[PDB]
Amino acid sequence: ALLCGVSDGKQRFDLSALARHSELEQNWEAVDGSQREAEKKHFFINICHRVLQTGQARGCPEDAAVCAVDKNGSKNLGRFISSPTREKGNIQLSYSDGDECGGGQKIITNITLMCKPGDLESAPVLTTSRADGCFYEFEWRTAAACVLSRTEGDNCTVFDSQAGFSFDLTPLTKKDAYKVETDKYEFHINVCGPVSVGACPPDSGACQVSRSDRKSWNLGRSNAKLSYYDGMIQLTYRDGTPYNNEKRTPRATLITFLCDRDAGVGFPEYQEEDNSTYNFRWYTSYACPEEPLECIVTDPVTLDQYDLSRLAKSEGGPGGNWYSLDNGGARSTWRKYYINVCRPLNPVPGCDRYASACQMKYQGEQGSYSETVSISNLGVAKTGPMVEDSGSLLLEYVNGSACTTSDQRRTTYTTRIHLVCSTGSLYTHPIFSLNWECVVSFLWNTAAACPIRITTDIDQVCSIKDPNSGYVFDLNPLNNSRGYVVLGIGKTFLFNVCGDMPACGTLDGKPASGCEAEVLVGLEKSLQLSTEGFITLNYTGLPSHPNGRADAFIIRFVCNDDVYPGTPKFLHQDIDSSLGIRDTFFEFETALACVPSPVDCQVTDPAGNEYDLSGLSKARKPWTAVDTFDEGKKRTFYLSVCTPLPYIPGCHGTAVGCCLVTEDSKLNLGVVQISPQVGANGSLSLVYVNGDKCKNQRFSTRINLECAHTTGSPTFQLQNDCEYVFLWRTVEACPVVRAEGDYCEVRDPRHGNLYNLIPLGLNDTVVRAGEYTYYFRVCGELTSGVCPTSDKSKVISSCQEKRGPQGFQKVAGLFNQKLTYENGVLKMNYTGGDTCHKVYQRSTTIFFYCDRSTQAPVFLQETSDCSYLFEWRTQYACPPYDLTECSFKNEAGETYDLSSLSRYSDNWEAVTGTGSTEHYLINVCKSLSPQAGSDPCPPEAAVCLLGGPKPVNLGRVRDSPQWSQGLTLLKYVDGDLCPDQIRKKSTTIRFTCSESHVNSRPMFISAVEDCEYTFSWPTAAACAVKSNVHDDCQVTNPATGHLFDLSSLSGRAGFTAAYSEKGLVYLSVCGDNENCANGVGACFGQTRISVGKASKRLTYVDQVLQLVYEGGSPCPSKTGLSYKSVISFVCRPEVGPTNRPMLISLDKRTCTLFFSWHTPLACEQTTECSVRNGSSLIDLSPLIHRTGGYEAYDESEDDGPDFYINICQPLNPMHGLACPAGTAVCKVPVDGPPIDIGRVAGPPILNPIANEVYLNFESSTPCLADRHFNYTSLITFHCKRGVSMGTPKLLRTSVCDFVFEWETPLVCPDEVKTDGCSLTDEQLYYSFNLSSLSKSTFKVTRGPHTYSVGVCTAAAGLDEGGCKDGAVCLLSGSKGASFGRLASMKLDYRHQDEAVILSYANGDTCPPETEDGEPCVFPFVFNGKSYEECVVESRARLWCATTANYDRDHEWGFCKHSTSHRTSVIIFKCDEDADVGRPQVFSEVRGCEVTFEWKTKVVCPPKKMECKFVQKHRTYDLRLLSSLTGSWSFVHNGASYYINLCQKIYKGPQDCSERASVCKKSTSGEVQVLGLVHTQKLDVVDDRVIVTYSKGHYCGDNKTASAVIELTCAKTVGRPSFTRFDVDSCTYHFSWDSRAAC
Amino acid sequence: SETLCGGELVDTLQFVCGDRGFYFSGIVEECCFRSCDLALLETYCATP
């Protein structure tokens, strides 16, 4: 049989070792035990031709090579009379008739072979059936039969192009080790890399150590030669250590790999050892070939194919994928994104296999180094192209690594990659967009992704497929309807190709090719190609040789580009009458046959009149032709020349030449192959073909071009037999002429002069434009710069450069010492630099126009030939001036000068009437810039008429003579002979004011052929004054003659405005920035988009500078607009770190980029808001909000943040509330913008009657009554104490007068000094004047800070001096703020502690916090500099940083400013050691409420005491009953009562404490001491004299004892004693009678 | 007369709403073909 090995076009597969051919064992038990009931585990399959008979295989019906055994008996499922076949990427066995089905289906068992290299054990399973047991499909994973035999490999790749199963192992390596566990020997191995342990000789690749005995033996040196085997991955090593053998057998080792779907990199496994060839099998997921997910998606809604075939980067790819960058912020959070389409990666070190999109970051990249490390790995190539809205193609991967989505459940990363379609084909990377809740977006720009017609399966014999990219061409345009006459060396043969011929067409089979070749026999057609110099077609004829082929000749077809539909041209003929075959062998080619492209379409004639149409190809706006049609909607033709259009949705095809769009249907008309007719009395016509519709009469387009004098736009001529002819006339169709020279000189421009350029080539030229930078020198031998890095003796003329990532200097073309004057332009060709993508040689081309000496050039677009374009406007290339100053600046209000309205490149042909047969070429004071268009007007003329009759002069230039101040002020002497034949044409120009950013031409008015014409230009350029007061960035205040100058910050360095996390805005004041293009003040993030051009006309409005830029980038809005920006400056009366230009809002009305800023440069007025009140200076400096505003709230309503209040500065700007700059008070409405309800007017005024301080604001808005603009609002102030420095509140509302009320403790007047610094209390009845502690500035220092404190005394003293009115100052850091105002001193007594609290209030602000409330560490370093306060840099709001170094940790949360000001609290402690001690440092609760201690006697001292008392003027004297030493004792109920009045204890008992009034000596209970004499209060009742004694024992819930005594009048001193005592009141009574009581 | 998509759409999109993030639920069907204004580019940005 031996029909069981299949070979494909280049490779072979064999099923040889899988099949048990006559070896007589158990066959494949092709079963896993999941469901079996009759246990029909048969499936005994030999592959080629065998059944082997043993237990459950004996009695198999053979001659089938397939067993179906059971309990019920034995069957045949399949025979082998077929051969194995090829499915998609598999081998398939279609097996034959085994035994019959129930319905006689003749059972067929399919077997699929999927290869899995490193499979010794392979048992297939019946996965699927037909559900009815007569069609058995098997899946087999074998080692066998997917590849040819072995091939040796590169550095660590098995890279083979033909077999195409090209593995790689390079991520398996590890610089640490791999540790293997046997009992007494480990095995130490790193694949493709050196052994990395010290016990081993490090020359090795692997070595085993005896872990019982620590003995090293070399198991071979490292190796890189990868050796694919047939089904195996063999890797083997070098010689190493011999044992004992006389052959000195060195220990070699052999490594094998088995594929696994989900193992990963795995562990190496000691297999065995047989004779010192060491064995290591391995399970690595890398050793396994993946399947390409099929990437062709059809169309659900219409019929249009797609194609994502050629984008998958298959090979050559060690990090050679599609890669996409992200620059953003600085040397942290940079990412480089790796991604591949429709298949997993060419494996990258340390990402994955079965991943598609690796995130991969930079580390130590600086200086051409260290591409990668790996951070996060996501994606699985699962779905394929899920199509979208007819051009855009969504594409999703899933099953990435874990992440979080705003505290949701943990899900995967998810690549989306949008593929919008475009026409710019080669070398377009994805462009990185987003990293937003674990949906990493991308955005592709271009493939040939979008346009694939289904082709409706047209199968015409004239139509052949092209499977290179996907194309079918059509030679139906060779339906040549009057025949052709072929050349012939025997005789002229006659020929058409398909479907045409009448002249030889009266035969059987209807011949289109069989003609006489005499002075004949029919030939049919069948055809083919191989796309390799080869597009052919046979011609099968009827009079065949018997059992042979008839007369059937071939026509090879290759492609020319610049020729007609063509001419068959007769390659050699040869008649052979001996053999029955006879072939004419005629071979021609035409242009119209091959792959359409951008055709580079400079083309010429035999008559030597060269042409170019590439003056029209550069049109970003696609061309349009005008039409004529019926009462319905008019049609629309799009049209381009030599270059296709951008993806108009709904006209498909490959080269969209001309897309006819009506409202209803979209007709593709043409493709791109150019051949203009050049032999005629007429001119060019270029042709577009292959409409491929219209009843086998296919569409075509041929737009016809004749030369006009002016610019134009095409039109619709007619339409016939569903082709078109247009008409189009412009300048370009005139026969162009150019001349050639040498050594940067040229000659003879039709003017007889020379052209020197070597002054421009004197020094280097750097064009620092965009992502690239070009070092190049004019007239070659470029030597300077950082690119002379080459060895070969060839000269460097131009070489480009990059920034850090793979910064390359590939050299452009070499010096060839040439330029050419080409139609008014000077240009050089610099050919032959090093290689581009495929084959392309970098050429550079440098242009020149002649202009007013502006010698800074700029690069234009990149061509398809990898070339670079450049452009200068120098002052060299224009010889023949007739120039005047053309002005009268002698008197003002005169339209003094007309300099900027001259022109030298080309010239004004006026806005003439509709239907001008004439062309009025005129410029203001220059004599006709030479247009290169046609037979020109002689350049001595300045006013000229072309169109219809000859170039005729109408006058020569002369310096401006006026007739009036206003009008008729240029005049042209000496035009040609008038009908009088006396005088010459004397023509005058007038000018008139308008405002027009692009004005019109001088509008042609009058015509009297006798020597007189007038022209009047409605201009923008007539009325102004050239002495605008400075016209540099300095302005003068009209009010008080103050000068505002700003040129101290006019850098080219620029600035940074933040609009995102990852995007900056560049900004430079009254000058052009260096980052973005020239003529740009400010530019955006990734591509440099202009916002407005740099002007220096700095105006001034209302204590604010309003610098204006205009005329920036095209805006997307419904009306055609540009961006503009108003950098509005505010007085900042200090210098802080936050003085950088914050982008404040965008306005969507007319595309306006608003911009706040600050400086101290801009305030004329010294800002003071502090006024006098007799002897008292009052101030409102600390009540300025410094970082934002304050908010006066929503009032008198509900369900609404209504007012913004800022006292004597203007308010600090805040992203996204466009309250226009320099506003004190701002109303936020519920609709439309906020409103300027006043600006800051002047100093606080008083009210001399009430003494409550006003302050006023005037406005620049009208009232709601239109009453004499001057919108007013004024604020009051109210003295009232408390901690909070208070808010504004709106109280009273007039129609245009708002009144804000205010509560604040600042305007409270300082009284006469105080009453005293003394804790005067009603309760203890004796004060503590701390006037003693008013000494001087203390210095308490604890933790990382010091302090400076002072009681009843401010100390802006020895250290800083600026702690103005600061009673408690932080002298640590630099300029530490104040804590509590000395006027705001609130001395306090704490009852239970019996200690004095000193409280201060309303200092400066408590330091700010993050939004999250995790407070900041404010002495920190950003970018090397240190800062204290929340900086604005590279984010759009204020932010602190919550680590000591933002360069190290990257923790920050936005600076949400508190309204809680700082404060302090001091405690004093009774200590007998010293009267005055030391303050101490207790706590910083979020670092503002800092509290202080003391160690004093000054607050305690009851020592000098008067216990005498008077009530109702009834005096006493009690100095007699005191006992200064000892006390009278009485001990009843075991309690010893030692007491005397207004004393200490004196010679008292044991264990009763210091300054004791009563100490009871108890029997079983504890000694307690109760009562004190400093809070002692004596009073006389009608009868009794009473006294109290507090601070005893703890009675109950914060209750103490008190000995309230009874003093009844008696004659002699007695003794008191104890009456009763309870637990609720804890009161003691004493019944004393004494002589000295009354 | 002219539009914005390619490199000029990947930045304007992250300009007009900046730091909120956004979607394609989509943009590229309008601003590649028809001339969008800077109203539509707001409403295809993620509401907070």
Ligand SMILES: *[C@@H]1O[C@H](CO)[C@@H](O)[C@H](O)[C@H]1NC(C)=O
């Ligand atoms: C076409 O012609 C070539 C050479 O004469 C021949 O090898 C080939 O078999 C022909 N093809 C057909 C389909 O007759």
Ligand SMILES: *[C@@H]1O[C@H](CO)[C@@H](O)[C@H](O)[C@H]1NC(C)=O
């Ligand atoms: C200052 O203002 C206060 C506020 O009423 C007033 O009591 C005091 O008399 C004023 N000073 C003088 C010197 O009048």
